[PDB]
Ligand binder design. Sequence first.
Ligand SMILES: O=C(O)c1ccc(-c2ccccc2Cl)o1
Ligand SMILES: O=C(O)c1ccc(-c2ccccc2Cl)o1
Ligand SMILES: [Mn+2]
Ligand SMILES: [Mn+2]
Length: 284
Amino acid sequence: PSRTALSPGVLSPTRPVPNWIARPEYVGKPAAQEGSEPWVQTPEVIEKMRVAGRIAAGALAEAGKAVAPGVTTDELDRIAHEYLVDNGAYPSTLGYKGFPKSCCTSLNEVICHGIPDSTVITDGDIVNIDVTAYIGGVHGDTNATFPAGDVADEHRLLVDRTREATMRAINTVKPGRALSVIGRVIESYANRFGYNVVRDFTGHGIGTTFHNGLVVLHYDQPAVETIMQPGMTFTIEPMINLGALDYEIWDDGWTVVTKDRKWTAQFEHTLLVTDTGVEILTCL
Ligand SMILES: O=C(O)c1ccc(-c2ccccc2Cl)o1
Ligand SMILES: O=C(O)c1ccc(-c2ccccc2Cl)o1
Ligand SMILES: [Mn+2]
Ligand SMILES: [Mn+2]
């Protein structure tokens, strides 16, 4: 057997960031200034996104190394937060639309936007950690689902196959191809196993802003005409459900859970379209 349905815990105090680490403009505001930015980035922007992406990838891998039964999701946030701040990066989620922590930690039936807190990870859990770094005036965004202890076969396979769906979609990225191929490839692969790809959350353009108005769907919709062009930067980040897509949001206003409490998994990279293919910006 795996654990029972989760419930919310208590948050630790807000974690401080030294003042010399520049804040994104939305910290201390209720909304963000984003959604109308260009989709192709300039070379200077891309070079700063490589640095933000590598720092985000390091924070994700250090917090993912700590996933084990007995560890709290708050402890993963401490690790991610400190890694970012020691690298002179601001954690982009902290204060984004009022989100209270430096990463999102989404176990088991939590689709996304789980809030690090007193929740204890236990054997059989799958733990998505999602971290974004703002440094050099740009963002870098990555997430991965990590197993805790011995995970049941149905949940292990969901994680491995989500990871594979994400990588197969990244390996389609090429100038001249339709953006819609990413969702065609993810949903065709998911559907081989009878999984359902979440539709109401998507990937996005990213650059000087977190969510720049470019939308990357992870389901099949070939009517989108957007073409991948050199210098475009965006995420591929499918959330894949064992059960139905219906979902609810907890009273905290953030945590998104499957209504049937069946488990879900997600992986994410920030990508650059190159002249030949793709470059993953969120690698170690
Ligand atoms: O794009 C992401 O990878 C992501 C993870 C969390 C969020 C997010 C979206 C909307 C409101 C707040 C938050 Cl933290 O966005
Ligand atoms: O373990 C690996 O080698 C592997 C393949 C894909 C990923 C991964 C890591 C971080 C975020 C996204 C993805 Cl797809 O990690
Ligand atoms: Mn993310
Ligand atoms: Mn993202």
